[PDB]
Design an enzyme around this catalytic site. Sequence first.
Site, PDB file in Angstrom:
ATOM      1  N   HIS A 188      -0.190   1.382  -3.484  1.00 32.49           N
ATOM      2  CA  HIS A 188      -1.564   1.842  -3.662  1.00 32.49           C
ATOM      3  C   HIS A 188      -1.889   2.873  -4.800  1.00 32.49           C
ATOM      4  CE1 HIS A 188      -5.518   3.447  -2.664  1.00 32.49           C
ATOM      5  NE2 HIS A 188      -5.901   2.235  -2.306  1.00 32.49           N
TER       6      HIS A 188
ATOM      7  N   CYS B 105       0.768  -1.208   0.167  1.00 35.91           N
ATOM      8  CA  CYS B 105      -0.041  -0.048  -0.125  1.00 35.91           C
ATOM      9  C   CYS B 105       0.856   1.220  -0.087  1.00 35.91           C
ATOM     10  CB  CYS B 105      -1.102  -0.115   1.291  1.00 35.91           C
ATOM     11  SG  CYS B 105      -2.396   1.130   0.770  1.00 35.91           S
TER      12      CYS B 105
END
Lengths: 186, 186
Positions: A124, A104
Site C-alpha cells: 500500500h 497492503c
Amino acid sequence: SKRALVILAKGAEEMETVIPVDVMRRAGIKVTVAGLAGKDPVQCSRDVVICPDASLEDAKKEGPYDVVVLPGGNLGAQNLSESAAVKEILKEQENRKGLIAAICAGPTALLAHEIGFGSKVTTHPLAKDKMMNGGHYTYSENRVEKDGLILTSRGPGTSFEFALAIVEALNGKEVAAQVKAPLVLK
Amino acid sequence: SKRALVILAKGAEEMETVIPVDVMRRAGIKVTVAGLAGKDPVQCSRDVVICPDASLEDAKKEGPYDVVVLPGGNLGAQNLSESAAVKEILKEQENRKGLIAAICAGPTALLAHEIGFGSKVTTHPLAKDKMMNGGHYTYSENRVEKDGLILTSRGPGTSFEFALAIVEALNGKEVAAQVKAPLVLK
C-alpha cells in the site's frame, strides 16, 4: 490439489482476507484460514469477525503449503511481524522454495522476518516507507508484483488481482481465467 | 451518522458481505451485520465463517435503517427470499421510502417479497432469468444500477462500486471519493 495457508491475526483487513480465501477456493485450492492467536474468532480491522478453520499451531502440522498468504491491515500486519510462529513458517516456506503472497501492509511482515530480501515488491502506498527501511527490497508501483516466489499487492482494490495472481501461479492461466469470468470484474 | 442493516444468511457470498460492511464503516456509517437465523456464526458460500453483530430479530428493534443491504450468493439469497422476517423488513423500508441495496443474486429476494416492482435493476448474469420471471422489473447490464430507492449490482467484482454507490447515496459524493482513494481501486 494445491494447498494455501492464510494467516489471520487481529486487525487484519477483512476484505484482503476474504477475497483471496474465496477466490482460491473457487479455483479448487484447499485453503486453511489459520488463527494466529488460536481457534477463537478474529476481530478484523473494520470489526468483521471471522472464525478461523484452525489455529496456526495445528495448521502448521498439516503443512507444507503451496502458498502462505499474509493479508494486510496495519494492526494485523504488526501482529504477524511480532509472531515467532509466523517467522518460522515463512522461513521454512522460503527454504523449501514455496510461494509467499502478501498484500497492503502484509509485506512489512516479510521485512520483519527478513524474508525475500533483494526482491521487487509493492505495498500500500502508505506502507512504502516502512517496507523500504534499509533498502532491502526494490519498490514497485505495479498493482500486483511477482518476483519469483515473492508475490505482493497494494490494497483492498487490488485483492482480486492479487488472488487471481496466486491462482495463476498455482493452477495456471486457464484456471485463473475460468475463475475470473463469473466474478464480473471490470 | 447514517445506519445500515446487512442481513447475513447461510450461503451468502462472503465477499459481497464483507466489502460493503468494510467500505460503509470506512465512510462512518453505523453498520449492523444481522444474522438471519440468529446470533450464531454464519457459514458463507465459500466456507468463510462470519460472526454477526446481532440477530435479525434484535437488529430490527434498533431500526429503522437508512439502508437495508442484501448480499448475494444463490443459497443466501434463497434463504432471504424464504424469510418472513426479511419480507417484513423490506416492506417497512419500502413504505418509509428508505434505500434498499442488493447485489448478485440478492435482488431475487426483492422479487420474492414483491419489492420495488417497476424499477430498473441488474443482477449477476446467471440470476437474470430468475429476476425477470413475470417481467416485474426492467433489466440493466450496468455494473451498478440505481432507480430511486432500489440500488442493485452484479457480482463480487462489482462489490466495491456497489458499496461506494451506497456511501454516495447516504453521505454524498465527496465522502465516497475520500473513502475510495485509499482502497487503491483501478
